[PDB]
Design a protein around this ligand. Structure first.
Ligand SMILES: [Cl-]
Ligand SMILES: [Cl-]
Length: 163
């Protein structure tokens, strides 16, 4: 198992513009297009600009994967540039690094950076405590199944939640 496979399970693959769990316009493998309520312009506009062609709200599998590669790359690089995230990432093992990349992909660097307390516990290797803390969040309450998977990953340092 690896980051791409992990995120592919968490986000799924949709070739037509869709609304995410928060009602935002997304496409492919969790690629957010816009937070705006306008489909026919705004979202489709963003989509065409992202892809480089007149799409009509539908993309191909290769197109989805191209967006996905960019987004994973961005996530990693964002973590590495973030004063708050970098040190946590550096302190972790390969499996847990993947769990942090996942949270970053879903919520944004800024969002993850706010789990101050959890971050400090992860850095200290206090696995069970960090898991408990991570669960007291809107994140866990809104997308509990996915959150539990990421949390188990941090807790165990294994890919069990995904197998
Ligand atoms: Cl983009
Ligand atoms: Cl969920």
């Amino acid at each position: 198992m690896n980051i791409f496979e992990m995120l592919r399970i968490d986000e799924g693959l949709r070739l037509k513009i869709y609304k995410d769990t928060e009602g935002y316009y997304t496409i492919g493998i969790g690629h957010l297009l816009t937070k705006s309520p306008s489909l026919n312009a705004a979202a489709k506009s963003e989509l065409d600009k992202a892809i480089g062609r007149n799409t009509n709200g539908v993309i191909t599998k290769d197109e989805a994967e191209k967006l996905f590669n960019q987004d994973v790359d961005a996530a990693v690089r964002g973590i590495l540039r973030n004063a708050k995230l970098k040190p946590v990432y550096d302190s972790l093992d390969a499996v847990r690094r993947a769990a942090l990349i996942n949270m970053v992909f879903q919520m944004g660097e800024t969002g993850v950076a706010g789990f101050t307390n959890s971050l400090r516990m992860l850095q200290q290797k206090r696995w069970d405590e960090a898991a408990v803390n991570l669960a007291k969040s809107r994140w866990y309450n809104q997308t509990p199944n996915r959150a539990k998977r990421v949390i188990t990953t941090f807790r165990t340092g294994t890919w069990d939640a995904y197998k």
